[PDB]
Structures are given as structure tokens and as C-alpha cells.
Amino acid sequence: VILTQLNEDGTTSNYFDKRKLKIAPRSTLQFKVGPPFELVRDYCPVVESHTGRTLDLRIIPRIDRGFDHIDEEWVGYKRNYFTLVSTFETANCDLDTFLKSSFDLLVGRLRVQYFAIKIKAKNDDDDTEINLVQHTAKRDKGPQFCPSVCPLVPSPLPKHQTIREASNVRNITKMKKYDSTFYLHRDHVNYEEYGVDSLLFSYPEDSIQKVARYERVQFASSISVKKPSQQNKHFSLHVILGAVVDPDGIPYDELALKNGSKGMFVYLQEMKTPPLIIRGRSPSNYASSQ
DNA sequence: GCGACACAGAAAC
DNA sequence: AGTTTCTGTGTCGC
Numbered sequence: 001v002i003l004t005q006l007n008e009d010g011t012t013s014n015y016f017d018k019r020k021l022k023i024a025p026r027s028t029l030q031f032k033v034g035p036p037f038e039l040v041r042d043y044c045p046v047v048e049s050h051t052g053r054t055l056d057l058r059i060i061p062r063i064d065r066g067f068d069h070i071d072e073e074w075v076g077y078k079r080n081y082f083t084l085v086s087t088f089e090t091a092n093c094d095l096d097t098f099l100k101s102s103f104d105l106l107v108g109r110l111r112v113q114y115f116a117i118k119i120k121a122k123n124d125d126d127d128t129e130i131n132l133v134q135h136t137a138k139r140d141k142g143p144q145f146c147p148s149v150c151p152l153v154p155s156p157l158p159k160h161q162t163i164r165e166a167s168n169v170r171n172i173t174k175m176k177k178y179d180s181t182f183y184l185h186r187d188h189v190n191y192e193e194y195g196v197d198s199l200l201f202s203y204p205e206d207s208i209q210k211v212a213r214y215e216r217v218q219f220a221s222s223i224s225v226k227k228p229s230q231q232n233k234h235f236s237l238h239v240i241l242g243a244v245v246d247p248d249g250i251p252y253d254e255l256a257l258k259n260g261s262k263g264m265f266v267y268l269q270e271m272k273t274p275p276l277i278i279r280g281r282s283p284s285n286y287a288s289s290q
Numbered sequence: 291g292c293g294a295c296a297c298a299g300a301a302a303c
Numbered sequence: 304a305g306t307t308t309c310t311g312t313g314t315c316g317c
Contacts, residue, residue: 018311025310026300080311137309140294168309171303216310221292281291281312288313 009159015068034063035074035273043267045106060157061086099200112243113202117212124236131220155210184208204258225280234275
């Protein structure tokens with residue numbers, strides 16, 4: 001009925017089938033680690049400006065809500081929230097040095113303005129993109145939006161428990177406790193330590209996230225979850241690390257820059273989940289029908 | 291099958 | 304210790 005796995009930090013993931021067991025909306029049992037991510041590929045090389053040394057990059061993603069491991073499949077629910085978090089790391093560069101240097105794409109060298117992550121959902125069988133939607137905590141009483149590109153600096157991925165604890169914090173004191181985990185405030189550094197060309201100072205905003213946290217995410221309400229044969233569709237969640245450049249034959253998405261001009265999110269690395277099943281609104285997907 | 295509204299119960303304070 | 308917030312899901316009606 002409930003299958004329990006121990007997480008890396010000592011919390012548990014408790015997998016249950018909502019067709020058989022109804023658990024309260026805010027139960028800690030709704031929090032669990034989802035499927036592991038796998039490398040899809042590496043794309044454009046990045047090199048430090050003078051040394052010419054190649055920056056080796058690694059996406060560090062995890063799903064902390066919305067997916068259960070049920071008899072050999074990973075299962076989500078159309079109507080319910082999932083959480084996908086990600087950082088990236090640079091194995092061969094400490095953060096403090098990284099922020100002070102400058103980086104080019106090796107395509108022929110385009111200056112990297114900043115690094116960022118975006119997420120996508122796909123039909124895993126045909127590579128078709130599927131829309132994702134996010135809400136605020138107010139849900140229907142607030143706006144819905146599509147996941148945005150998240151400027152980010154390299155950082156360890158917080159433990160599952162930390163993502164849990166930070167999920168619905170209002171109180172100012174607790175916010176302060178978690179600030180340094182999720183944000184770098186560029187306006188608080190010593191500006192004299194940095195060259196005008198430094199990477200830190202080509203980020204678009206002073207408040208820079210250390211962790212991309214996509215919470216209250218759902219597949220669009222219009223997705224069909226079954227194939228015509230009534231077999232389940234297979235979906236997959238993708239995380240892409242990119243370098244944003246000023247575009248004045250390699251994979252990239254256009255990005256609406258801060259100054260207004262047309263920018264380029266140039267792909268560096270992409271990871272994805274194994275196939276995912278999503279259960280629709282059918283009453284037979286719920287324990288209430290029994 | 292989908293948008294909207296409603297109820298419920300644990301978290302957050 | 305009580306109030307409000309958040310989120311899984313029951314339900315209506317088109």
C-alpha cells in the first residue's frame with residue numbers, strides 16, 4: 001500500500017497509488033523524490049576568456065513532489081502539483097572565481113552574459129513538446145503562468161527536506177533563514193572586487209537565484225494522457241542549461257532580453273526523466289470510485 | 291473531457 | 304491554541 005524509500009538526506013519518499021489510497025493534501029506523504037534524470041546530451045562548449053580552459057558543467061536536478069514509483073512506472077496526476085528543482089555545478093571552478101571571470105561559447109566566440117535553466121515537457125515517444133503551467137499558492141485566486149527561464153549561478157542542490165521546508169514560508173524571519181540558500185544578492189557584494197566585464201555583472205537582475213525551483217507545476221489541462229489505442233502516453237520532463245548571449249547553426253531558443261533586444265538562449269546541456277505516465281481526471285484514477 | 295467552484299484537513303503561524 | 308493558508312480531489316454543468 002505504501003512503499004518507502006530512504007532519501008539521501010534521511011527523509012523518506014512514500015509511494016502510494018491514489019487509485020487505492022487517499023491521503024490529505026498537505027500530508028508530508030505528498031512530498032517524495034521523483035524519477036532520476038539522465039543526460040540527453042552536451043551541446044556548446046564554454047571556455048574562460050584568457051585561460052581558454054573548458055568549463056565542465058553538470059545539471060543537478062530533482063523532482064520533490066508529484067510523482068510516485070508504482071510497479072516499475074513513474075506516475076503523476078494531471079490535476080496535481082509537481083515540483084522540479086535544479087542547480088548546476090562547475091566541477092573545475094569555485095563560485096567566487098567563476099563570478100569574477102568571463103566566458104565565451106566555442107562555436108567564433110560569443111560572450112556569455114549569464115547562465116540559465118529552462119524546463120520542458122515532451123512526449124517521450126515522438127519528441128513533441130507539451131505545455132506546462134504554474135500557479136501561485138493562491139491557485140485560481142491568482143495568475144497562471146508558463147515556466148520561465150531562470151538565471152542561475154552554480155550551487156549545490158538543496159536536500160529534499162530543505163525544499164520541503166521552504167515550500168510555503170511567509171514569516172519574514174524564516175524567509176531570512178533560507179535567503180542565502182536560494183539567492184545571491186549582487187547589490188550586496190563589494191563592487192570594487194569585480195571588473196566591468198565580470199560574469200556576475202552581466203546577469204540581468206541584482207537578485208540572482210542559486211536554485212531554479214519550479215513549484216506548483218502541472219501539465220496543461222488540455223493534454224490527452226492516453227494514446228488512441230488506450231495505452232498510456234509516455235511523457236518526460238527535460239531540464240536544459242543554457243548560456244544567454246547577445247546575437248549581434250547550433251541549438252538555441254530565442255529569449256526576450258532585459259533591454260528589449262532579441263537574445264539567444266544557447267543550449268549547453270540537457271537532461272531528462274525516464275518515461276512518465278500521467279493519470280487524467282477519470283474517476284477510476286481515484287480511490288473514491290471504489 | 292474541461293473550467294469552475296467547493297470542501298476538507300494538515301501545515302504555517 | 305485558534306486562524307488562515309495551501310492543495311488533493313469531489314462535483315456540477317456545458
